[PDB]
Amino acid sequence: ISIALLPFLAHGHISPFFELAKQLAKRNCNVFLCSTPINLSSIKDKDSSASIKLVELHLPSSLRNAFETAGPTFSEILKTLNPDLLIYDFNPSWAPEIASSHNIPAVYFLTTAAASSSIGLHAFKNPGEKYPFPDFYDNSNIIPDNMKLLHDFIACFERSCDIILIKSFRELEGKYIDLLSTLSDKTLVPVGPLVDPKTEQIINWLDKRAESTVVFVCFGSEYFLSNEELEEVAIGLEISTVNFIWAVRKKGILPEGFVQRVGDRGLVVEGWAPQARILGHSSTGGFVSHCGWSSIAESMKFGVPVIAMARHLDQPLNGKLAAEVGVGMEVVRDENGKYKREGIAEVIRKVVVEKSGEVIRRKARELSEKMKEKGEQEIDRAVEELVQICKKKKDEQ
Numbered sequence: 001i002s003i004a005l006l007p008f009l010a011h012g013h014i015s016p017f018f019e020l021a022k023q024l025a026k027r028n029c030n031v032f033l034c035s036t037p038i039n040l041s042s043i044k045d046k047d048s049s050a051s052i053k054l055v056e057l058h059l060p061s062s063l064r065n066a067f068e069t070a071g072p073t074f075s076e077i078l079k080t081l082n083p084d085l086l087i088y089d090f091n092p093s094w095a096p097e098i099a100s101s102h103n104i105p106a107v108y109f110l111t112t113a114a115a116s117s118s119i120g121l122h123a124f125k126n127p128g129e130k131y132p133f134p135d136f137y138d139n140s141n142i143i144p145d146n147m148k149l150l151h152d153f154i155a156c157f158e159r160s161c162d163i164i165l166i167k168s169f170r171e172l173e174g175k176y177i178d179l180l181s182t183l184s185d186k187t188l189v190p191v192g193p194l195v196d197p198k199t200e201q202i203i204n205w206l207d208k209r210a211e212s213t214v215v216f217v218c219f220g221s222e223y224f225l226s227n228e229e230l231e232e233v234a235i236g237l238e239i240s241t242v243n244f245i246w247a248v249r250k251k252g253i254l255p256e257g258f259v260q261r262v263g264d265r266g267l268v269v270e271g272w273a274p275q276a277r278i279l280g281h282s283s284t285g286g287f288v289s290h291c292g293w294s295s296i297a298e299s300m301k302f303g304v305p306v307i308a309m310a311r312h313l314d315q316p317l318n319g320k321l322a323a324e325v326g327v328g329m330e331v332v333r334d335e336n337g338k339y340k341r342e343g344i345a346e347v348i349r350k351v352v353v354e355k356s357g358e359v360i361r362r363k364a365r366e367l368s369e370k371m372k373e374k375g376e377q378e379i380d381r382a383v384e385e386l387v388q389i390c391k392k393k394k395d396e397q
């Protein structure tokens, strides 16, 4: 009934843990605890009445080496609370270790895709064998943090007790979920997806547009596109003849005359854009994204098709995944054709306004409704399986 969540020391991993807290606290009255430094706790000081937030402290020298030393603080926190279960992230390293010290079961929480992880663990469990689904990875042609990254992944997959929580749903990759289950010898439990004055202009502009006609573009923080990269997608949006809303992020670089040339038909935003509010709006019918996992989950929760412009890390593997189930399409690449006007305009026209992408549109809605039809019960089964894991540990000798 009482769970304690230790997310990693990164903002990209605090929001999933916080929304999981909100979702598990509103059902079965789960006495929730969430521990992380106050710097990462205070971002979620808004509508969090159901969960209980816990502080975590470290001391300086003379989060890098602090992470590697704040272990005892988490151990003291666990001894003070004595919770029935611990949910850890990717790189706490010692959190499973301490959970095994206080006789507390530790359940791993994967905030990434089953498909992506499946390639990696297949690689560990089957070094010689090839991927069971060659439509996703062809280990054939080319197989040329080092190993410290691999070991952390296989450890956080192995150290999980019985089950492994995942921020995913069956309707997107149940086959890869079952593959991961068979690979890790653990049961993969999907928890489904998970959910200032300047924002009224975006909504006011978006309300005046027709249904499923606006294309949202945002590529996330970090790896800030060069002006040469910006100009390609800018001209692709200009020649797409479709309404778009583009958000782009320390020297300031910008295309010359582009904002003037397009006049309206498009709104440029500097910082935080209403991603969820734009995707959920009925006027939106396209999302040009860098294929971040949380971004893909948000795009799929509202039935908005995906325009894949991945670049690094798991974003390609995520991207093509959206192209496998038929809810998205990728842009053609040259030597580095991720910045080309013709491919971007072609895919945008085909997905949003053309009939050839209707198969992508319908399947985007037919799946979205699915996510709202079987909703809430995924987390119910997750909670009851967590209760089963807690009650099976109740073993004296």
Ligand SMILES: CC(C)=CCC[C@](C)(O)[C@H]1CC[C@]2(C)[C@@H]1[C@H](O)C[C@@H]1[C@@]3(C)CC[C@H](O[C@@H]4O[C@H](CO)[C@@H](O)[C@H](O)[C@H]4O)C(C)(C)[C@@H]3CC[C@]12C
Pocket (backbone or CB within 6 Å): 010, 012, 013, 090, 112, 116, 117, 118, 119, 120, 123, 149, 153, 313, 314, 317
């Ligand atoms: C060829 C090799 C070596 C292995 C074969 C497997 C493979 C086909 O190739 C691909 C397929 C599976 C793969 C994508 C792998 C990559 O290798 C390594 C990634 C990685 C560990 C990298 C760090 C990432 O973690 C991010 O790290 C960023 C840095 O800060 C943050 O910005 C993000 O917030 C944070 O999520 C996260 C945990 C999401 C992923 C998890 C999945 C994994 C293993």
